[PDB]
Scaffold this active site. Structure first.
Site, PDB file in Angstrom:
ATOM      1  N   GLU A 131       9.219  44.168  31.871  1.00 31.79           N
ATOM      2  CA  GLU A 131       9.346  45.353  32.059  1.00 31.79           C
ATOM      3  C   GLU A 131       8.314  45.416  33.788  1.00 31.79           C
ATOM      4  OE1 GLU A 131      10.750  47.432  30.470  1.00 31.79           O
ATOM      5  OE2 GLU A 131      11.868  46.512  29.431  1.00 31.79           O
ATOM      6  N   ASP A 164      10.615  52.698  35.859  1.00 26.86           N
ATOM      7  CA  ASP A 164      12.155  53.398  35.393  1.00 26.86           C
ATOM      8  C   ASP A 164      12.495  54.662  35.203  1.00 26.86           C
ATOM      9  OD1 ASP A 164      14.362  53.334  34.252  1.00 26.86           O
ATOM     10  OD2 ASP A 164      13.741  53.754  32.035  1.00 26.86           O
TER      11      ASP A 164
END
EC number: 3.2.1.17
Length: 185
Positions: A73, A86
């Site tokens: 991530e 993101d």
């Protein structure tokens, strides 16, 4: 720690696709690529190792799986901008989506890890409900895939990761996890 959600060591994996390997400047793909990327994040991960294990204890989730997610991530934080990634949607080591969750905690703290890990649990349980004829270990892989793409995206075992980022998310994460499990997670 195995956790209550299946043994990650029993999950098959084809590791990182070219799509994940290339950005990391590797000229090969597959499980070794996953392992290399994880290894590169090991020192940074290790910063958090006792918290990760607390969280794994509290939730009965394998701390290796938590680590594998973190690596994928956020590169254990190294990929973030002041906590965020993101496209400004993801928060913290485990990149909780702020659009659907209220992020809690310091970006690299226990409350954050608890949040991300609870969400993982909820994905795994979704997959368990969706596919009751799968094994626990199958369901675990599906859960991890759903952590990226939502349980709606999991419509198969073998091709679950189609539609995930780089079409390899759970395969990659599982390999990363299996690595960390050999390095004190």
């Amino acid at each position: 720690r195995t956790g209550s959600y299946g043994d990650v060591n029993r999950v098959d994996t084809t590791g990182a696709s070219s799509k994940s390997a290339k950005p990391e400047k590797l000229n090969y793909s597959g499980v070794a690529a996953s392992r290399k990327i994880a290894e590169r994040d090991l020192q940074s991960m290790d910063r958090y190792k006792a918290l990760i294990k607390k969280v794994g204890q509290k939730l009965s989730v394998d701390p290796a799986v938590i680590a594998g997610i973190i690596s994928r991530e956020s590169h254990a934080g190294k990929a973030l901008r002041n906590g965020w990634g993101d496209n400004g949607n993801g928060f913290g080591l485990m990149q909780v989506d702020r659009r659907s969750h209220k992020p809690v905690g310091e970006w690299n703290g226990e409350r954050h890890l608890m949040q991300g890990t609870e969400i993982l649990i909820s994905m795994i349980k979704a997959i368990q409900k969706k596919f009751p004829r799968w094994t626990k270990e199958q369901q675990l892989k599906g859960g991890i895939s759903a952590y990226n793409a939502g349980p709606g995206n999991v419509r198969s075992y073998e091709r679950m990761d189609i539609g995930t980022t780089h079409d390899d998310y759970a395969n990659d994460v599982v390999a990363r996890a299996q690595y960390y499990k050999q390095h004190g997670y």
